[PDB]
Amino acid sequence: EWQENKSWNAHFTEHKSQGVVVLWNENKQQGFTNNLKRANQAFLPASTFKIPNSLIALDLGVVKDEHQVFKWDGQTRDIATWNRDHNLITAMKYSVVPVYQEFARQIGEARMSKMLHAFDYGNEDISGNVDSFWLDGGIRISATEQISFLRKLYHNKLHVSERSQRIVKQAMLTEANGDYIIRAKTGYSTRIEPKIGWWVGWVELDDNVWFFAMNMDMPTSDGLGLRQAITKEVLKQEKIIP
């Protein structure tokens, strides 16, 4: 059910990096990873938490739909794409933390906690500030736990409406061409050591789906592009994408 393929470690070592890639073949119900231990080590989800956060905000009516505009609050932040109006789609695309902080405040601690338990999400622990616990609070999730959650989302099996799940999966759209569709979310955790980058999601093919979750040490922002690059090298190696 879970096979360790250390040959993938070469895709990390070659970049003077360390991390884990977990793949799940949905048709075969078989998983693969380069590092079983790290695949089950739990980290802050950081912006990958925007997947459950979006679902909860939609199902509770905090977000009415993917067109609702969340106006910039006028406070200049260091990430230029954050200093503008957003909807759910663009807030996901640019990982706009302040928009999702407001979602969390309107959701509130009690409902957030209850929904993360219903989702079986990570350690289900929201300890910390309601508007930042996924960045510097008590919540933790492993790569294998990301896969479990994403599989439920793909199959509309999470305990929210079908509509909420379809909208978030739309918002996760990252890449599409004649060969594959990637629905995914990046993450970048810097507030608690070790600093890591995340990429979690799945690859849709004509006749199969491959779920993936990767994290890697990210001592500086210079390596952020390796989250997608390393994953894609694994996907290419396994003949999942050309």
What one-letter code names the amino acid at 23? L
Phi, psi at residue 50, to the nearest 5°?
A: -65, -15
Residue 112's nearest CA partner among 128, 92, 99 is 128
Count of residues touching Cl ion (by CB under 5 A):
2
Options 7, 17, 47, 54, the catalytic residue: 47
Residues 149-178 within binding reach of Cl ion (CB under 5 A): 170, 173
Q: Respond yes or no: is residue 47 known to be catalytic.
A: yes
Question: In this complex, which beta carbon is closest to Cl ion, that of residue 170 or of residue 208?
Answer: 170
Question: In this complex, which beta carbon is closest to Cl ion, that of residue 113 or of residue 174?
Answer: 174
Instruction: Map residues 111-150 to x or -, x wherever contact with Cl ion holds by CB under 5 A.
Output: ----------------------------------------
Q: Please, what is the Cα angle at 189 between 132 and 150, to 5 degrees?
A: 85
Residue 141's nearest CA partner among 122, 116, 127 is 122
Looking at the DSSP bridge assignments, the partners of residue 22 are 33, 213
Question: In this complex, which beta carbon is closest to Cl ion, that of residue 173 or of residue 229?
Answer: 173
- For 171, the 3-state DSSP assignment is helix
- The least CB distance from residue 174 to Cl ion, in Å, is 10
The CB-nearest residue to Cl ion is: 170
Give the Cα separation of 183 and 59 in Å (integer).
20
Contacting residues toward Cl ion, per CB under 5 A? 170, 173
- Residues known to be catalytic: 47
